């Protein structure tokens, strides 16, 4: 899974993203190097997601306790894209295919 749709309705059920991502930690760890645009050959079929999102600009609802996490939508191979889903603590659900420009609810 790694459409907006797919990861939605993922997370709404089962409260965690799909088998397919790794944190950026768990990435480097397996060898994946930024600069070099490489996810796809140290880990294929495997998406950056699950880190801690800022949220610095206040574009996302806030709310104390609240905290957002993000994941990489539609990658499949290169340097990472510009789509983004962005998930709450308590689950709301929003994303971004503008390099977090900007934001959309979808859930």
């Given at each position: 899974?790694?459409?907006?749709?797919?990861?939605?309705?993922?997370?709404?059920?089962?409260?965690?993203?799909?088998?397919?991502?790794?944190?950026?930690?768990?990435?480097?760890a397996?060898?994946?190097?930024?600069?070099?645009?490489?996810?796809?050959?140290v880990?294929p079929?495997?998406?950056?997601?699950?880190?801690?999102?800022?949220?610095?600009?206040?574009?996302?609802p806030?709310?104390?306790?609240?905290?957002?996490?993000?994941?990489?939508?539609?990658?499949?191979?290169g340097?990472?894209?510009?789509?983004?889903?962005?998930?709450?603590s308590?689950?709301?659900?929003?994303?971004?295919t503008?390099?977090?420009?900007?934001?959309?609810?979808?859930?």
């Amino acid at each position: 899974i790694n459409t907006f749709d797919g990861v939605a309705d993922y997370l709404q059920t089962y409260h965690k993203l799909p088998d397919n991502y790794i944190t950026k930690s768990e990435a480097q760890a397996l060898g994946w190097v930024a600069s070099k645009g490489n996810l796809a050959d140290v880990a294929p079929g495997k998406s950056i997601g699950g880190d801690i999102f800022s949220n610095r600009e206040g574009k996302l609802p806030g709310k104390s306790g609240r905290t957002w996490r993000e994941a990489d939508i539609n990658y499949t191979s290169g340097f990472r894209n510009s789509d983004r889903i962005l998930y709450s603590s308590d689950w709301l659900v929003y994303k971004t295919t503008d390099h977090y420009q900007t934001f959309t609810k979808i859930r």
